[PDB]
Design a protein around this nucleic acid. Structure first.
Length: 17
RNA sequence: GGCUGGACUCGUACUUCGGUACUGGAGAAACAGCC
């Protein structure tokens, strides 16, 4: 599913926010 | 959270109008796994 990018991309990206 | 993604509900695109697809969009690094 898309909830992988919403956990993989989400975990590497939130780090920036 | 130290790491991954399997649903949701949305917003937005599509589309048979069901339903899926976009986390270069959130609630929410929530829940599951290991907890």
């Amino acid at each position: 599913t898309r909830q992988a990018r919403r956990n993989r991309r989400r975990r590497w990206r939130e780090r920036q926010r």
